[PDB]
Scaffold this active site. Structure first.
Site, short mmCIF file in Angstrom:
data_model
loop_
_atom_site.label_atom_id
_atom_site.label_comp_id
_atom_site.label_asym_id
_atom_site.label_seq_id
_atom_site.Cartn_x
_atom_site.Cartn_y
_atom_site.Cartn_z
N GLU A 112 -2.85 13.86 0.37
CA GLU A 112 -4.80 13.55 0.48
C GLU A 112 -4.70 14.84 0.85
O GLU A 112 -6.48 14.97 0.79
CB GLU A 112 -3.84 12.63 2.13
N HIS B 211 1.92 8.90 0.87
CA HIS B 211 1.30 9.23 0.21
C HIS B 211 1.90 10.11 -1.54
O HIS B 211 2.52 10.45 -1.13
CB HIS B 211 -0.17 9.66 0.69
N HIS C 195 1.14 -1.42 0.00
CA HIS C 195 0.11 -0.09 0.29
C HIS C 195 1.24 1.30 0.37
O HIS C 195 -0.02 2.31 -0.38
CB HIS C 195 -1.10 -0.11 1.25
N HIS D 72 5.20 7.47 6.85
CA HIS D 72 4.77 6.44 5.95
C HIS D 72 4.11 7.20 4.74
O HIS D 72 4.36 8.90 5.40
CB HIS D 72 4.50 5.63 5.52
N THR E 53 -6.30 7.23 7.50
CA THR E 53 -6.67 7.05 6.09
C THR E 53 -6.33 6.55 5.03
O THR E 53 -6.92 5.89 3.94
CB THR E 53 -5.87 8.66 4.97
N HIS F 97 3.11 11.48 6.32
CA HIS F 97 2.21 11.50 7.91
C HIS F 97 3.51 10.59 8.54
O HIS F 97 3.79 9.40 8.52
CB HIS F 97 1.63 10.33 7.67
ZN LIG Z 1 -0.70 7.85 5.46
#
Ligand SMILES: [Zn+2]
EC number: 4.2.1.1
Length: 257
Positions: A103, A93, A61, A91, A195, A116
């Site tokens: 996000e 995104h 992911h 991590h 999220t 994050h």
């Molecule tokens: Zn995240």
């Protein structure tokens, strides 16, 4: 199960995780013309001098840089927070193109990526207990824009080849997360959620106003990761972001005028 494809993306998550349509979901759009300065927030305190990174993992992911959280080594305190929150992992995104990937959004602007830093409230003893509490987690969110390189990111970028596919991990010791922070710690804060599934409504979000810059070559290496496992058809790990959710009965507060 869940992912970011056509058939299993955010718009499907609610079937298995009905809180996806909950009252305090994240991310959100941050409207800078309605967020209000809050003179009660206390100064924010990022104490990462004793952080012990251990490993980096491709979970299918994103990738997580994991820390030793079995003592108060790297902690977030202050700001909106009561008590002490221990760093467990960070991590990112990110997008397939530089015009998407974050996000949170700012006045509907999407950044190229979002970092994050996830922290859990020590009053609950373990992460798994903390996520069952409305004040269990504190996530420091930092936007990434494409421009100059971020020197403190390169050690991350350079290990990505070794964790290309889902389930791979590598030793990742002695990494300093301070090298991922912008200059200013001005922030927005609101109550929300994880999220990714299980989307638990356990997070105090702290979103820094100032983005960090990364280079195009850095981001391009993120986009060479895979969602799939070893030997399976390649599915590039890109566009692993959830879009903004309804704000509902929440207010976003600013730490700055
Ligand atoms: Zn995240």
């Amino acid at each position: 199960h869940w992912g970011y494809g056509k058939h299993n993306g955010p718009e499907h998550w609610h079937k298995d995780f009905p809180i996806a349509k909950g009252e305090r979901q994240s991310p959100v759009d941050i409207d800078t013309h309605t967020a209000k300065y809050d003179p009660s927030l206390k100064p924010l305190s990022v104490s990462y001098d004793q952080a012990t990174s251990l490993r980096i993992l491709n979970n299918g992911h994103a990738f997580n840089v994991e820390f030793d959280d079995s003592q108060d080594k790297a902690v977030l305190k202050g700001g909106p927070l009561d008590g002490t929150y221990r760093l467990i992992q960070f991590h990112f995104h990110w997008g397939s193109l530089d015009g998407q990937g974050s996000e949170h959004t700012v006045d509907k602007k999407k950044y190229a990526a979002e970092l994050h830093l996830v922290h859990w409230n020590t009053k609950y003893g373990d992460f798994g207990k903390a996520v069952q509490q409305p004040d269990g987690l504190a996530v420091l969110g930092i936007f990434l824009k494409v421009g100059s390189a971020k020197p403190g990111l390169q050690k991350v970028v350079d290990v990505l080849d070794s964790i290309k596919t889902k389930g791979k991990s590598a030793d990742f010791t002695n990494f300093d997360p301070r090298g991922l922070l912008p200059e200013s710690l001005d922030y927005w804060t609101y109550p929300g959620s994880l999220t990714t599934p299980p989307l638990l409504e356990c997070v105090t979000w702290i979103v820094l106003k100032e983005p960090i810059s990364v280079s195009s070559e850095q981001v391009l290496k993120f986009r060479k990761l895979n969602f799939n496992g070893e030997g399976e058809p390649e599915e590039l790990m890109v566009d692993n972001w959830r879009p903004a959710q309804p704000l509902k009965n929440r207010q976003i507060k600013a730490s700055f005028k």
